[PDB]
Amino acid sequence: MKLLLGDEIGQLKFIEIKKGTDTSNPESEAPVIQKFGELDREKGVLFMLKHEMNVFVARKNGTIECWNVNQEPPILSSLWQLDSSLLETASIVSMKYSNGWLMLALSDGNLLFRHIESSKLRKLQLHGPLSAVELHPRIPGIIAAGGKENDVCLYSCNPTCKSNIDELELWRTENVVKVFQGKNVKNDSLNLRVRVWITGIVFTEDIILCFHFATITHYGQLRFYDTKHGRRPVSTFDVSTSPLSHVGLLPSIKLLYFADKRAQISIFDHSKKKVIGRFQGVKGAPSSIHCLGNVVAITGLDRNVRIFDADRKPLANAYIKALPTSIIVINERDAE
Amino acid sequence: KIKNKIVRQQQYMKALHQKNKDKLERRKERAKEEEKDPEKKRLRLSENIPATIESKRVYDETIIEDKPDEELQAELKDDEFSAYFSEERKVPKLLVTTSKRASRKCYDFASELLDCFPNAEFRKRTGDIEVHEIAEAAAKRGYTDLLVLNEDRKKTNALTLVHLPNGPSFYFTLSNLQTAKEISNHGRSTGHIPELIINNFSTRLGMTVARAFQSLFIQTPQIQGRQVVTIHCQRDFLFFRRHRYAFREKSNMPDGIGTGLQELGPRFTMRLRMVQKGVWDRKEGEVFFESNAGEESDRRKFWL
Amino acid sequence: KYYPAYRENVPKKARKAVRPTKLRASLAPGTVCILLAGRFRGKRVVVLSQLEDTLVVTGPYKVNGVPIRRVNH
Amino acid sequence: VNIIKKRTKPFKRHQSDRFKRVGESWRKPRGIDSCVRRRFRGTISMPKIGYGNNKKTRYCMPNGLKAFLVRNVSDVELLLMHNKTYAAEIAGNVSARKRVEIVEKARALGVKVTNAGAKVRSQE
Amino acid sequence: RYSASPALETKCAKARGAYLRTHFKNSREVAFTINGMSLKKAFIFLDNVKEHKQAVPFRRFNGQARWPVKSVKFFYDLLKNAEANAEAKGLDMDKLIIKHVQVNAAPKQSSPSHIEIIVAEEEEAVPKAN
Amino acid sequence: TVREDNGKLYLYMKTIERAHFPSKLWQRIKLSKNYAKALEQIDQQLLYWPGRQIHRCKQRLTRLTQYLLKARRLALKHQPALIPIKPKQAHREASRERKALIAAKLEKNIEKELVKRLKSGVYGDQPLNVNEEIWNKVLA
Amino acid sequence: MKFSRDVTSSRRKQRKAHFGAPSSVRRVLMSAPLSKELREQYKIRSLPVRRDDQITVIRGSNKGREGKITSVYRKKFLLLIERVTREKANGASAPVGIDASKVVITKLHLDKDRKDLIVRKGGKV
RNA sequence: AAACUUUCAGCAACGGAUCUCUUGGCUCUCGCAUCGAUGAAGAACGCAGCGAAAUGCGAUACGUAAUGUGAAUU
RNA sequence: UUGAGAAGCUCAGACGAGUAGGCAGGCGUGGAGGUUUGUGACGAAGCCUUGGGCGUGAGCCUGGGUCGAACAGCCUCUAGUGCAGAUCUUGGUGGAAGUAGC
RNA sequence: ACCAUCUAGUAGCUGGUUC
RNA sequence: UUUCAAUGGCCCGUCCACGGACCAAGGAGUCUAGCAUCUAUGCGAGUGUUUGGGUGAUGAAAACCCAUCCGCGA
RNA sequence: GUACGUGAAAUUGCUGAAAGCAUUGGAAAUCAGUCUUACCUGGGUGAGAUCAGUAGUCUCUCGAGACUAUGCA
């Protein structure tokens, strides 16, 4: 398993860990680690997009970089910068790739899109505080945004779906219109309005147009949606008491996972409407979880990297000294 | 195996007596051949070291080597506690507070904690203010660390401290809390700033706690007062003691010089239960370290 | 929350009407009375008026330093 | 009404202090020459019906409420209509899991709990 | 457990003997005598009692002074053990003071006794810096 | 009777003519959140019933409303967690501490560290605490 | 519910019969479930344990461990497994025994008698 | 003042109560019919495991043959 | 006006020593049936306790300590069911006493 | 003389008889 | 709770005497047949199945059923 | 820790404090529990539902509950 990870001090570590590696056992061999990048806390890594083989890395100051991992160690293939005026009050909150477009959503709602080849940069304005924004995998030009006291909205750049749209005309300010807006659920038994604070968004139509996405909130609520059925969530589950950190999909078992800020990572079975197992042996909040094939990489505040499979069987484990901030799986298969 | 109680007690007695006889005979013959040949006396003494929990401590790779590490020092020079350890040398300002509606027993211990720290305040907790609200309020009022002494049922059982404004927050459970009256051969503290000594914090999590305790004390002790505050971590139990020390002669000491300790108080112990990254919120705090009780049953496994 | 939830033992109508207090005969306004209790015990004070229960009395503030205060008869 | 107690001392058995074999539970003195049964001066008192307390404030704790022993959450919900008249008391054999659930429920119900601080800690 | 903890662990040493074939009453009077002394003085006192120099006074079981040889022999060895326990514990030998010596009865098998001794270092007060 | 369900109060009625059908024995109506309307609903559904039976239903509605009110207001307020005490963990912890305190050797650890601090001279050239006679052996 | 007055429901008799069972009876009392695959290919739910059987520990402190049964300690109804031991104070590795029901057989030591037992007990080798 | 004497509290002994257990007793029911001159019951003496103040066995001495389970005994 | 456990609630007045002896109502223990959607390894029972509470009482409830596997309320059934003493039985332990004495 | 049953031999009597 | 003060206070049971060193545990109107009264219950010029027979597939020593007598009453 | 589950009382040692049966109170030590946050009223802002000069589904018996949309007067 080849993986690489970024710390809060901005350093990048490429780990060549093999199955069975467990640092807590003296007899196990330590994983092969080579490190590169800046050593400043002001330039810490935030997000670690995987543009197939190429990898996009964010920084606390916005110094986006681009490393090709076909070469060992990866080299800085491209470097991009963001204006310092956009970092005075806001903060980078997500980064996703969609048909040759890189997204650098800000907390305040600024939506920065940069084309890969043409290097065209477009700014989009949105609603208030943003905490989670996602991009549709299949359908081009679909944006799902949500934040604290801000319901999920679907800003469809194109009215129809088709199968492909030319890249230049995408993401224009005058072409994006919201085609969906979440409606808050009814008040609870105590007649207290249910607070809304979206924290993660995932599109679950492949495992369940015709948008079928799932969100997770700051109040430990995992809400599934079906835009055809209605604006309110189709189903709601209180999967945790702690704020849910981030949500995603597991391609191997065709299922969904989520994590909260109390070191709890579990997989949710929409088919049975219940949580079916958990990723044991994790301490500290999981900073980022990446899945690729039949493997999952969890990195957290325990300064460890935990490698499980989609069946929640612990495959490998290692210590990385410094405090991490994101993970990414390059090679699912073993070292040999 | 013998289901007759008396016989099994007589069978053990015969077994014990024979076991004691032949272990004495082995010891006696070994003693005779060691005094005759010292080359095996210290030969045995160099390998047959008695085992102890600390020597049989389970392996953890998070234990940092005594040699300096660049990566650790890179992470420690710009973190939350950096303003205390950098050239700025920001003087700590402590805020001490109890849980809501505490008793005189809580204050009789809070006063001792106040004695341990010069320039440390104490605002009685009143009304509907919360730990996440005091932290914001104390942040704008120039405070840099807020300690909340939790009691219920007339006993101070916990102590949560938050590093202001968003520094890591630690949750401790105090135990064996003794006041200066309860200590035999105590003393009366003076106004001199104490000197802090910290021992046995090998793990990297230990340094996060050690820096948190270091940041409480003024960085320049008044040596002329010879007051020393000790924070010692043994088997994850953190012991807090305060002493008065005076150097004098000591024949048993290696260099002939040794110090006499007179305890000042307060005397107590802590266990680190929770570490959060940010202001202490019990329900929504980002857990840096949670103490799993079932994993602490291994007496050889420590996280501090 | 308004319909009573309990037995609500309503008090029987007490027949204790409030009548004006008959003070002493010697507590006429303008007399000098010795204060017996309070911070100003032992002070001699001129009575101004006869309140419903107390006497509004005051020592001439330039004389004994006893401000305008009530005192029980 | 105020909770008036005619007597506050226990009715110790005669000569319960002299002997450890003699317990302090009350036993009527069956003896026919017993001076104390004869109610001489200075002799210790004996349970009479006149010490019996007021039927209106019998069984009432000093705060005017009556103890109602409770074993689970379903019991505290019975005291919904009697919270000015009764106080919940958690049994000694109820675990600390249930004790928390009993106390939290009773708090909304406006019920006083006589031993709500037992077996538990505070975290705040 | 030892009955009393009159010092701190780093500054004390203990030695004990259980079911010792001696007399409980004689041991109690010897224990009362040597309680509170210093290890050097107690050693001198026990040797003196052995060689008919001083007599152990009897206060509770007087029925006065006497020279119980069996009792002092047990206390001499126990104190030697406690002194050795102070060597292994890295204690000083000039401030060693018998802090808590106690004798308890043992299961009648006679009148055997259990003896426990705790020797500590002389507590001192450092001068106040004022 | 009036009883709570999912934050909403209902009036439950049973009549003698459905006594032998336990499933259909009780009928249920939903009472308004408006207190005055809810009182009017109990009067309207229970008219020509005995007065003391209507009195007892309205008493229960009052006491259930206040129960719902304090339930919400406790939810809004911040209460401490009521975390249980485990006898075995506490006993084990007390045992380990006692052994860890003994194994800590606090007085020796303080003294050895403090003397080696003096030898390294972390204090001044002649520290104020140490007197002249003792400091003579520091250099020697 | 038992309906036979040949079998006893007396606890005193069941406990006496269990602990005073001879070594031939104890052979059946120490039986372990087969793994799912062996259970679904040999059509037998459970077999008495044997030496040299490959098992996995399912319950207890040694959960998840595997190994071959070095011996069967029938007197104490205990199994002994390779490398599933406990280190003594002096450094010796004293083995720890586990109940036969707390393991699962993942590879059988197939003698000819087992195969005859398999076919007899509704099995297909 | 102190010892001594008493009382109280703490800790350490002493003792083995209580509580919980239980391959034991007690009681009732049901089924059956089988010791010995072809050497019984009992007693002694041996044998090897051993703890024997127990057990099994008889110079083939914890038993041999045959049968069964099928791979121990500790 | 809600105050029918009609075996409930409510009004009034008088009265109060007590051996033998009579009557009534209650408290407790082991086991039985039913019941409490009963309690329990987040600690049952027991025991300890200058912690608190209830009942005139028999007694009950509870906090804390100790402990480690079972227990209880309520309605009936049942009995080897309640101790201060019998120079009671058994065990344990005292003062005599480190005395008489060897 | 002793031993085992009869034997829980013979009671106007003694001592005791539990919330 | 301990102690002090003022006041009162003569060892308990048993029949002067007899028992009492202390503590724990055990320790005494029981079961059964007959009779008499009283109360409750069922039926009522009747009344009582349980000697026995029938029967009981969930435990079958129970519960259910009842032929011929027989008692006591008239 | 085999003088081993729990471990009572009588009883013994040590340490600490005090002193040389009941009534009532003092001194010393200790302990119980003790409330503030709510009620009403007014407005602003949004929220929804038992509201809609609103549309559907399921279970019971016109309308009674449970819902899913949509709106927030």
Distance from C-alpha of B238 to C-alpha of B200, rounded to nearest angstrom = 10
Strand J positions within 7 A of protein Cβ atoms: 18-19
> In the complex, which subunits touch F with 3 or more CB pairs below 8 angstroms?
A, B, C, D, E
CA angle D52, D57, D63 (to 5 degrees): 125
* DSSP letter (8 states) at residue G122: T
Q: Which of F68, F71, F72, F70 is nearest to F8 (CA)?
A: F68
Pairing of strands B94-98, B145-151: parallel
Chains F and A share 3 or more Cβ pairs within 8 Å: yes
Task: Please give the residue of chain A at the shortest CA–CA distance from B292.
Answer: A283
Determine contact: D117 vs chain B, CB below 8 A.
Answer: yes
In contact, A291 and A254? CB cutoff 8 Å: no
In contact, A245 and A199? CB cutoff 8 Å: yes
Q: Which one-letter amino acid corresponds to residue E94?
A: D
> In the complex, which subunits touch A with 3 or more CB pairs below 8 angstroms?
B, F
Please give the tally of structural domains in chain G: 1
For F74, the token pair is 């406790």
As a rounded value in angstroms, the CA-to-C1' distance for B72 and K43 is 101
Phi then psi for residue F109, to 5 deg, are: -65, -40
Q: Which residue ranges make up each domain of chain D?
A: 1-118
Distance from C-alpha of D53 to C-alpha of F60, rounded to nearest angstrom = 32
Q: What is the largest CA-CA distance in chain B?
A: 79
A203 Cβ partners below 8 Å, 6+ apart?
A134, A136, A137, A144, A211, A212, A213, A214
Which nt has its C1' nearest the CA of C4?
A: I2
Chains D and F share 3 or more Cβ pairs within 8 Å: yes
Distance from C-alpha of B188 to C-alpha of B231, rounded to nearest angstrom = 20
Phi then psi for residue D23, to 5 deg, are: -75, 175
As a rounded value in angstroms, the CA-to-C1' distance for B142 and K65 is 97
Task: Please give the residue of chain C at the shortest CA–CA distance from D83.
Answer: C6
As a rounded value in angstroms, the CA-to-C1' distance for C7 and I3 is 10
Q: Which of B198, B269, B231, E88 is nearest to F101 (CA)?
A: B269
CA distance B249 to chain F (A): 7
For A56, the token pair is 């996009």
Strand K positions within 7 A of protein Cβ atoms: 8-10, 12-15, 22-24, 58-59
Specify whether the backbone of G60 is left (phi greater than 0), alpha (psi in -120 to 50) or beta: left
Q: Is A89 exposed, middle or buried (0-12, 13-18, 19+ CB in 10 A)?
A: exposed
| Beta-carbon count within 10 A of A127 CB | 16
F26 Cβ partners below 8 Å, 6+ apart?
F12, F13, F14
Q: Chain D partners of C5 at a C-beta cutoff of 8 Å? A: 81
For E38, the token pair is 């210093």
Q: Which of A255, A45, B267 is nearest to F97 (CA)?
A: B267
> In the complex, which subunits touch D with 3 or more CB pairs below 8 angstroms?
B, C, F
Which nt has its C1' nearest the CA of D22?
A: I84
C8 Cβ partners below 8 Å, 6+ apart?
none
In contact, F106 and B263? CB cutoff 8 Å: no
Distance from C-alpha of A179 to C-alpha of A225, rounded to nearest angstrom = 14
End-to-end Cα distance, chain F: 95
Q: Is the peptide bond before F127 cis (omega within 30 degrees of 0)?
A: no
Q: Shortest CB distance from B228 goes to which of F101, F114, F115?
A: F114
For D47, the token pair is 């349970």
Q: Is A168 exposed, middle or buried (0-12, 13-18, 19+ CB in 10 A)?
A: exposed
Chain length of chain C? 73
E85 Cβ partners below 8 Å, 6+ apart?
E13, E14, E15
Q: How many CA atoms lie within 13 A of B94 on its CB side?
A: 24
**E strand segments, chain D:** 66-70, 86-90, 120-122
Task: Collapse the DSSP code of A289 into the 3-class scheme (helix H, G, I; strand E, B; otherwise coil) and give the result.
Answer: strand
In contact, B80 and B167? CB cutoff 8 Å: yes
Alpha-helical regions (H) of F6-105: 35-45, 51-76, 87-104
Determine contact: D98 vs chain F, CB below 8 A.
Answer: no
| Beta-carbon count within 10 A of F131 CB | 14
In contact, B242 and B263? CB cutoff 8 Å: yes
| Beta-carbon count within 10 A of F86 CB | 13
Give the experimental resolution in Å. 3.8
Scan for tokens 């006898």, then name that residue: F87
Task: Collapse the DSSP code of G106 into the 3-class scheme (helix H, G, I; strand E, B; otherwise coil) and give the result.
Answer: strand
Structural domain boundaries, residue G20:
1-125
Chains C and B share 3 or more Cβ pairs within 8 Å: no
Q: How many CA atoms lie within 13 A of A47 on its CB side?
A: 23
Q: Is the peptide bond before B165 cis (omega within 30 degrees of 0)?
A: yes
CB of D23 lies under 7 Å from some atom of strand J: no
As a rounded value in angstroms, the CA-to-C1' distance for B6 and I95 is 34
Chain length of chain F? 140
CA distance B271 to chain D (A): 14
Method by which the coordinates were obtained: cryo-EM
Q: Which of F126, F114, F100, F102 is nearest to B194 (CA)?
A: F114
Q: Which of A330, A313, A321, A284 is nearest to A20 (CA)?
A: A313
Q: Which of F44, A319, D51, F86 is nearest to B205 (CA)?
A: A319
Q: Which of G56, G95, G99 is nearest to G79 (CA)?
A: G99
For E41, the token pair is 């003085």
In contact, E45 and E37? CB cutoff 8 Å: yes
Strand H positions within 7 A of protein Cβ atoms: 3-5, 10-15, 22-24, 51, 68-74
Task: Collapse the DSSP code of A263 into the 3-class scheme (helix H, G, I; strand E, B; otherwise coil) and give the result.
Answer: coil
Question: How many interface pairs between D and F have CB atoms less than 8 angstroms apart?
Answer: 46
Domains of chain B, start order: 70-290 (3.40.50.10480)
